[PDB]
Amino acid sequence: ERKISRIHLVSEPSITHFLQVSWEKTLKSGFVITLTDGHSAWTGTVSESKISQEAATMAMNKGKYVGELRKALLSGAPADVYTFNFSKESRYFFFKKNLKDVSFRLGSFNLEKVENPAEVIRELIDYALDRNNLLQAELEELRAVVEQTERSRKLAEQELIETSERVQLLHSQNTSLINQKKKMDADLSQLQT
Amino acid sequence: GSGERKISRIHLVSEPSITHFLQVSWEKTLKSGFVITLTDGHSAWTGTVSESKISQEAATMAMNKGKYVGELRKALLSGPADVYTFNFSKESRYFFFKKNLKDVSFRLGSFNLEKVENPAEVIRELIDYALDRNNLLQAELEELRAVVEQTERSRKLAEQELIETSERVQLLHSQNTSLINQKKKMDADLSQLQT
Amino acid sequence: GERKISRIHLVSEPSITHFLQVSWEKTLKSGFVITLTDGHSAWTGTVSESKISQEAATMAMNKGKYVGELRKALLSGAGADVYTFNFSKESRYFFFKKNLKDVSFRLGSFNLEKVENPAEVIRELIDYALDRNNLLQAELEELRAVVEQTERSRKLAEQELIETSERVQLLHSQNTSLINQKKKMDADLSQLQTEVEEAV
Amino acid sequence: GSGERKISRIHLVSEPSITHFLQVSWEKTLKSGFVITLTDGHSAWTGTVSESKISQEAATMAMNKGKYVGELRKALLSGAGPADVYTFNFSKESRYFFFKKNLKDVSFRLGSFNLEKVENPAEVIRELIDYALDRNNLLQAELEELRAVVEQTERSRKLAEQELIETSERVQLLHSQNTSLINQKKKMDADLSQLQTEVEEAVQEC
Secondary structure, eight states: OEEEEEEOBSSSSSSOEEEEEEESSOSTTOEEEEEEOSSOEEEEEEOHHHHHHHHHHTTOOHHHHHHHHHHHTSSOOOOTTEEEEEETTTTEEEEEEEETTEEEEEEEEEOEEOSOHHHHHHHHHHHHHHHHHHHHHHHHHHHHHHHHHHHHHHHHHHHHHHHHHHHHHHHHHHHHHHHHHHHHHHHHHHHHO | OOOEEEEEEEOBTTSOSSOEEEEEEESSOGGGEEEEEEEOSSOEEEEEEEHHHHHHHHHTTTOOHHHHHHHHHHHHTOOOOSEEEOOSSSOOEEEEEOOOTTSOOOEEEEEEOEEOSOHHHHHHHHHHHHHHHHHHHHHHHHHHHHHHHHHHHHHHHHHHHHHHHHHHHHHHHHHHHHHHHHHHHHHHHHHHTTO | OEEEEEEEOBSSSTTSOEEEEEEEOSOGGGEEEEEEEOSSOEEEEEEEHHHHHHHHHHTTOOHHHHHHHHHHHHSSOOOOOSEEEEEETTTTEEEEEEEOSSOEEEEEEEEOEEOSOHHHHHHHHHHHHHHHHHHHHHHHHHHHHHHHHHHHHHHHHHHHHHHHHHHHHHHHHHHHHHHHHHHHHHHHHHHHHHHHHHTO | OOOEEEEEEEOOSSSOSSOEEEEEEEESEEEEEEEEEEESSSOEEEEEEEHHHHHHHHHHTTOOHHHHHHHHHHHHTTOOSTTEEEEOOSTTOOOEEEEEOBGGGBOOEEEEEOOEEOSOHHHHHHHHHHHHHHHHHHHHHHHHHHHHHHHHHHHHHHHHHHHHHHHHHHHHHHHHHHHHHHHHHHHHHHHHHHHHHHHHHHHTTO
16 A cells, blocks of 8 residues: 655745655554655654554544544645645654644654665656556556447347347237137037037 | 656666666657656756657668657657666767567667756656656546446346346247147147047 | 534524534533524624533523533534524524423523624635545545455455365365274284184 | 535635635536536635537647546546646636646646626525535444444454364364374285285295
């Protein structure tokens, strides 16, 4: 599981930054958050115990806290109500939620600077290109399913009108047969004398 | 809306360790020219292949220009018949052979890519574009999963109606053969009762 | 940040559907801000904690029982088929009662002054509901992942239990046929053990 | 199945302070046509974009219609990013258009629709609020049901796994007897020749 977001930090408002969050099937089980500005990178890990501690700090249901994390760190910057800020000196990444004249902090994470930003960026670029090819193949598969279903429907429309011509040609045969059956069945009592 | 671009993974034999990325961007056709950008996560190299340059490279190989640009489309826009190489000193020439396992390789192209002085902006522009195109494909999928859902239900609508009719023809066909069997017995009894 | 929005049916204007927004702290008995709107204007007032106790003592019922009735009335539906809501648009008084058998008694009465920023309040109310939807829909993405994760573990658990049960059936029959082979080979040894001593 | 609808908050450039709300409703497929509704909390504007208008704007942009409809899905549905810039004329009460701004200062008019004021905007807002509160109940009901599926599936997982800890114990102890019986058979085979060749050595001794 992996999602790359385009966030806008208050520290450097000019340079648009990228936020890569990676976890395993559940965000409440922990995740790895990466911040990159195209040259250097900052990667930190948020454990399951840290999420429960941050949720218990501001008095919030853990299910509702992960909902806020999955809404601020994964949707991107849709949902501009979140104010992201990363201090490069202290190497801390904190974001807050803005509405109703209240800007309370929602999370405080410690992202340490990576000594191999080239590999981190190339792995990010490689994942974005792999997700691109997957969505392209799924589009070609889906387009093939549409032309097969419509083709299968058109065949089902023509087989029905042929079978409907057969259901009435055969229903008229039973009616023509049951008439002489009932006519001969009464004629069998006449020959009985 | 204008602008066309394809980003590809390339294996540079100069640096076989890492995997380089090639960003080819052009207008509407490769015949008019294209801007080719090479990056490695830290630095970036960009060159502008003019339309005249493609004509010279196609003429020096005695190859039809329409066939030559077909090979440029083949190598730079997909992703190993083609082998790529690039030198880091100053002779910044992104040249790629077409190693054809028929006999031996031969030169296919060569362009000058100068090292840009803002590689961070190039990479962000490269990453930002890749994310935007993934959202467009994801939206195109949501639009298409709704079309296939509508055609499937309309298909199964006519499918159950055909099976409903095809079941009925087999109903009054075994019933038709039943009436044939009854009139067959009444025919035999008409001859036995004739006596 | 506890807030609840619910639609109400005013008997003074029964043709339209008004909306009620109750905002309160951690506990409703401590007080709440009650907002009313009709899609154009809005009226909002404040119910202090002492106003709750004064209303509770005015009808001689326990405070906790009264705040419980406030959760049933001011929260979770209306028009609901038991509580009758009414708002005097002239007097700016929010008055609601509870219908029983043949006796309907007043449950609360609070003053709501008209707000000077009706579009801003509606703009805040819509922004909140859309924000809570994006929050609940994010919890569905998390919880659907938990279902698929638990479904996978259960499915392989039943699959493994089926194989381990089918293994004990092939194995029990294999031992059954093996005890019989052991039974017949013992009868052949005593036959050959005799022929050794008998042919001496 | 009711209808398809999405309500997103947008920030116009004619009034960047207040938060306008954008309501787009369609029937299954977006290319079939949709209805745009703009509101600020007082007045409201409603427009109707048919299937023909979508093909016309797609022919002007020279894009594939599937891409243009996909580009409309990104901007209109769930729109709150700096990629798409929205604009609307209040005094001219017409021409709601939106751009697509990316890096290197590239901008093109992605859409242009003329929506007109509503005579009764209060009823439009109440209907918008009524829908938002209905999905709030529909989502919270889907959660309570999903919470029951999680613990029920965890119940069946613990049950089959504790029955596994009993079934597996019988398999291992039954397999230990299998190998113990095969070894007795193998040794009983070897002890059958020493008796067979001994009988044969008695008849080969006259």
